[PDB]
Each structure stands twice: as C-alpha cells, then as structure tokens.
Amino acid sequence: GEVVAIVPAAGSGERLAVGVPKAFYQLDGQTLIERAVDGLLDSGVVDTVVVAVPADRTDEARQILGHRAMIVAGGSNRTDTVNLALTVLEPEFVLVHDAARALTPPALVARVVEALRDGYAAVVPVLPLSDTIKAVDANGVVLGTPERAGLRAVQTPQGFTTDLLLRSYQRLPAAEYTDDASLVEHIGGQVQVVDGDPLAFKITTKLDLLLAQAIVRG
Amino acid sequence: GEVVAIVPAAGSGERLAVGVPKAFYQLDGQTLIERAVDGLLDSGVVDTVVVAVPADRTDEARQILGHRAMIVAGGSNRTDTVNLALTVLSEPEFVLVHDAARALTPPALVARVVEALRDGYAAVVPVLPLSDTIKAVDANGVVLGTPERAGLRAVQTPQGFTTDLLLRSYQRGSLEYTDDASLVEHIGGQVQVVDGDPLAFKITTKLDLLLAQAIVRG
Ligand SMILES: C[C@](O)(CO)[C@H](O)COP(=O)(O)OP(=O)(O)OC[C@H]1O[C@@H](n2ccc(N)nc2=O)[C@H](O)[C@@H]1O
Ligand SMILES: C[C@](O)(CO)[C@H](O)COP(=O)(O)OP(=O)(O)OC[C@H]1O[C@@H](n2ccc(N)nc2=O)[C@H](O)[C@@H]1O
Ligand SMILES: [Cl-]
Ligand SMILES: [Cl-]
Numbered sequence: 001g002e003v004v005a006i007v008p009a010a011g012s013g014e015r016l017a018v019g020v021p022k023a024f025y026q027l028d029g030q031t032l033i034e035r036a037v038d039g040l041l042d043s044g045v046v047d048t049v050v051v052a053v054p055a056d057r058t059d060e061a062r063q064i065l066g067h068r069a070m071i072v073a074g075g076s077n078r079t080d081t082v083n084l085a086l087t088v089l090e091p092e093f094v095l096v097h098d099a100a101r102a103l104t105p106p107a108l109v110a111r112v113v114e115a116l117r118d119g120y121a122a123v124v125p126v127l128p129l130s131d132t133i134k135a136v137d138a139n140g141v142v143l144g145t146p147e148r149a150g151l152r153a154v155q156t157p158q159g160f161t162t163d164l165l166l167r168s169y170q171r172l173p174a175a176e177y178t179d180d181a182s183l184v185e186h187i188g189g190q191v192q193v194v195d196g197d198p199l200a201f202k203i204t205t206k207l208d209l210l211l212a213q214a215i216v217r218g
Numbered sequence: 219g220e221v222v223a224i225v226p227a228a229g230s231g232e233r234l235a236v237g238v239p240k241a242f243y244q245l246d247g248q249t250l251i252e253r254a255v256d257g258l259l260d261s262g263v264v265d266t267v268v269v270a271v272p273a274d275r276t277d278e279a280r281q282i283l284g285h286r287a288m289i290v291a292g293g294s295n296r297t298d299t300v301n302l303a304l305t306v307l308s309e310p311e312f313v314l315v316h317d318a319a320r321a322l323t324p325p326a327l328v329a330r331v332v333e334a335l336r337d338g339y340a341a342v343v344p345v346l347p348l349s350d351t352i353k354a355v356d357a358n359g360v361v362l363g364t365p366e367r368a369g370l371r372a373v374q375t376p377q378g379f380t381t382d383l384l385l386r387s388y389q390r391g392s393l394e395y396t397d398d399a400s401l402v403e404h405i406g407g408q409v410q411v412v413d414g415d416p417l418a419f420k421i422t423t424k425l426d427l428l429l430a431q432a433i434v435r436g
C-alpha cells in the first residue's frame with residue numbers, strides 16, 4: 001500500500017508575523033517547507049509528497065523542492081487547502097502534515113503509518129497538556145475547567161485510509177474545523193491516538209521560532 | 219492593600235526527568251525557584267513571597283532565597299502544597315499563586331494580574347490561545363471528539379484572588395484540581411481572564427529547558 005503525504009503550506013504567516021508566509025521562512029538556511037518535506041521522506045514510509053502553497057508561490061515551491069514533491073495551490077483556510085490537495089487524489093493511506101511542524105522526527109511519521117498498517121482507519125499523534133485548559137466566553141469570563149487528564153494536544157502527521165478521509169472531506173455549513181481528524185469524527189469515524197513527540201511542535205509564535213533555531217543550531 | 223504571592227515549588231521533578239526536583243534545577247546559574255521569586259519581586263506589586271518546597275529542602279531553599287521569601291514545606295500534590303502555604307496567612311488584600319516552573323514570567327504580567335484585581339475582579343487568571351487542536355480522548359486512546367478550539371484557553375500563572383475568596387475556596391475544597399481558579403469555580407466564584415505572555419510558559423519537559431536556555435542566554 002502506497003502512502004501519500006499532503007502538506008498544507010498555503011497560510012499567510014499572519015500570527016508568527018515574521019514578514020513572510022511561514023512555510024517559506026528560512027530556518028538556518030532551509031525553509032520550513034523544505035524541512036517538513038525532508039522529514040516526511042526521511043521516515044522511509046512516505047512514497048509521495050503533495051505540498052499545497054499560496055497560489056503566487058507555486059513556482060517558488062517547485063524551485064525549492066524539486067522532485068521531492070508535487071506542488072499545488074492551496075486555499076483561504078487550512079481546511080480549504082487540504083480539500084484542494086485532496087483533489088490530486090489512489091493510495092491506500094494519506095497523511096496530512098503541517099509544514100509548520102518542520103522539526104517533526106521521521107520516527108513519529110513512521111509510528112503513525114505503522115498504526116495505519118495495524119488496521120486503525122484514522123490516527124493522530126497526541127501529547128498531554130502542560131497547561132490547565134479552560135472554557136472562556138467572549139467577555140473573558142471563565143465558563144469552567146474540563147478535566148485536563150481527559151484531554152490531549154494533537155499534532156500532525158494525522159493519518160487516514162484514503163477512502164475515509166475523502167468521504168469525510170466530502171460530507172454543518174457553518175463549521176469550522178481546525179484539523180483533519182475533526183471531519184472524520186464528524187461522520188462517525190473512530191480515531192485512535194498514538195504518542196506524539198515534543199519535537200513535532202508547531203512553529204506558531206516567535207518563541208517557537210526561537211526554540212526551533214536552538215534545536216537546529218544545537 | 220498588601221499582595222502576597224505563594225509559589226508552589228514542592229514538585230518531585232519526575233516528569234522533567236533530569237535527576238533533580240524541578241524547582242531546584244539550575245538554569246544558567248540560578249535555580250528556577252530563585253528566578254521565579256526574583257520575577258515576582260521585580261514586578262513592584264508583590265509585597266511578600268511564600269515559597270513551598272519539598273520538606274527535606276526547606277533549609278536549602280532558605281540558603282538560596284534569603285529574605286526574598288518565607289519558606290515552608292509543601293505537600294503530596296499541588297493543591298495540598300498551596301493549602302499548606304495558605305495557613306501561613308493566619309490578612310493581605312490579595313494573594314497570587316505562581317508556579318516556580320514558570321520561571322521566566324515577565325514582571326509586567328504579574329503587574330497585569332494585580333491591576334485586574336485592583337480593578338475589582340475577585341479572581342483573575344492569565345491566558346493564551348491554544349496552538350494545537352485539543353481533543354477529548356478516552357482511557358483506550360480513542361478520540362471522543364474535538365471541542366471548538368476558539369472557545370478554550372491555555373491558562374498560566376500567577377493566578378490572583380481576593381484573599382477571602384481563595385481561603386474560602388480552599389477551605390471548601392478541603393472537604394483532582396490542576397489549578398487554583400478551579401477551586402474558586404467549584405464553589406461558584408466567577409473568574410476573569412487577562413492576556414498572558416508566551417514567556418510565562420511552564421517549564422515542563424526537556425524541550426522546555428532548551429527554550430528556557432535560549433531565552434536566558436539571548
Ligand atoms: C492541524 C493542527 O496542527 C492540529 O493540532 C492544528 O489545528 C493546526 O492549527 P492552525 O491554527 O491551522 O496552525 P497554523 O500554524 O496557522 O497552520 C498549520 C498549517 O496549515 C497551513 N495553512 C494555513 C491556512 C491556509 N489558508 N492554508 C494552509 O495550508 C499553514 O501554512 C501551516 O503550515
Ligand atoms: C497551575 C497551572 O500552571 C495552570 O496552567 C497548571 O495546571 C499546573 O500544572 P501541573 O501539572 O501541577 O504542573 P507542574 O509543573 O508538575 O507543577 C506546577 C508547580 O506546582 C509545584 N508542585 C507540584 C506538585 C506538588 N506536590 N507541590 C507543588 O508545589 C511544582 O513544583 C511546580 O512549580
Ligand atoms: Cl501560515
Ligand atoms: Cl502564522
């Protein structure tokens with residue numbers, strides 16, 4: 001069975017705010033997108049990579065990546081982007097992996113694929129939450145504190161049988177998903193977790209960038 | 219009105235996994251506990267600090283901190299520790315509870331939560347948006363579902379309260395809480411959030427130490 005990894009890299013980088021769309025920021029001489037793609041390939045369990053980038057950077061993305069990946073244009077939000085990439089299509093398994101998780105260890109990638117090959121139809125890597133999490137309303141008032149031990153922070157790559165992912169993305173007009181496993185949960189698919197990895201952290205803030213720099217220079 | 223800050227520093231260090239109780243880990247020449255206490259005092263809005271440490275390190279803590287703080291022994295869990303520290307108040311208008319593990323917390327954040335208490339909010343916690351999607355997961359690693367990320371916040375410290383409200387909440391709790399606001403919520407108190415700060419991250423894993431080093435050495 002073949003495994004295709006889709007890499008959403010079409011965001012604007014508006015929150016990190018380092019003056020360029022995040023995927024194209026050069027971390028110690030390599031863009032996040034190149035690093036993320038290399039990690040997927042180094043896992044030894046990914047056969048094809050499809051990267052989705054801002055429409056005005058498709059040429060740039062090919063210049064960077066060469067034959068490491070197929071390049072397509074992404075969309076106005078992460079969900080839209082994944083949907084466009086999915087259009088490219090049939091492999092047995094599909095991974096969806098944030099370019100922003102550029103330092104993900106290849107072994108995590110392999111761990112996700114192994115769980116798919118173990119027969120889990122949908123797989124996400126998770127970590128325990130360091131912070132207490134609270135539900136908060138629009139006025140800054142706390143609604144309550146869900147039990148932390150019952151919650152997990154979820155990373156990527158998220159892995160799926162291709163059939164299930166396709167059906168999930170095909171199927172709430174006013175939602176609204178922050179990851180891919182959400183669509184699978186929505187249509188009733190069972191999602192299994194595996195242990196994530198601190199190194200698969202998402203480069204989100206300038207502190208995350210500081211840490212990524214310390215890791216790669218270290 | 220006086221402000222006393224309670225610093226839970228009595229954890230075992232088992233999770234951090236570097237062969238020392240975490241509060242006594244020396245980050246670039248200063249223990250997390252010394253750094254955390256100095257941060258509180260630097261804020262200009264904390265009048266008294268009470269630190270709670272493992273029972274066999276009370277002498278060591280005093281030797282380290284000197285008259286920057288009163289030292290007491292903590293307990294078997296974080297709630298127990300805070301409870302023991304509260305008995306020392308056997309009077310201030312406000313009380314902050316601050317993790318020694320959030321050693322790089324900016325003094326301005328401490329001042330921000332005190333400002334809110336003085337603005338009339340009886341219970342105040344600093345918060346940040348979530349970076350990762352969060353999922354509810356059962357004991358078998360099966361995902362139960364994904365709550366809307368935008369409706370949730372990661373909570374930091376210092377958490378601030380009117381002294382009466384906190385004391386009453388702990389008294390009634392003494393009849394698993396991962397923070398102090400949760401006890402206030404449990405008896406019906408209302409908690410307001412303020413914006414936290416990425417620098418007030420809790421040093422929890424080895425990767426966190428890597429980031430702490432990059433910050434203090436920068
Ligand atoms: C999938 C998870 O990693 C699971 O925790 C998160 O929910 C992702 O949360 P998020 O807020 O979408 O994180 P971001 O850092 O802003 O973007 C994650 C990845 O989605 C890509 N993304 C962003 C929006 C857009 N119009 N198209 C994209 O393909 C970004 O380039 C980035 O590489
Ligand atoms: C209060 C919050 O920071 C809000 O997000 C978290 O919920 C705290 O979560 P936590 O799992 O208790 O995090 P930890 O890093 O293990 O400990 C937080 C602080 O509580 C202190 N600690 C924990 C156990 C205990 N027996 N005595 C305590 O004084 C630790 O020394 C540490 O300085
Ligand atoms: Cl982005
Ligand atoms: Cl961003």
Ligand SMILES: [Cl-]
Nearest residue numbers: 229230231240
């Ligand atoms: Cl600890």
Ligand SMILES: [Cl-]
Nearest residue numbers: 230231232233
């Ligand atoms: Cl621990």
Ligand SMILES: [Mg+2]
Nearest residue numbers: 011012015078
């Ligand atoms: Mg985004």
Ligand SMILES: [Mg+2]
Nearest residue numbers: 229230233296
């Ligand atoms: Mg603990």
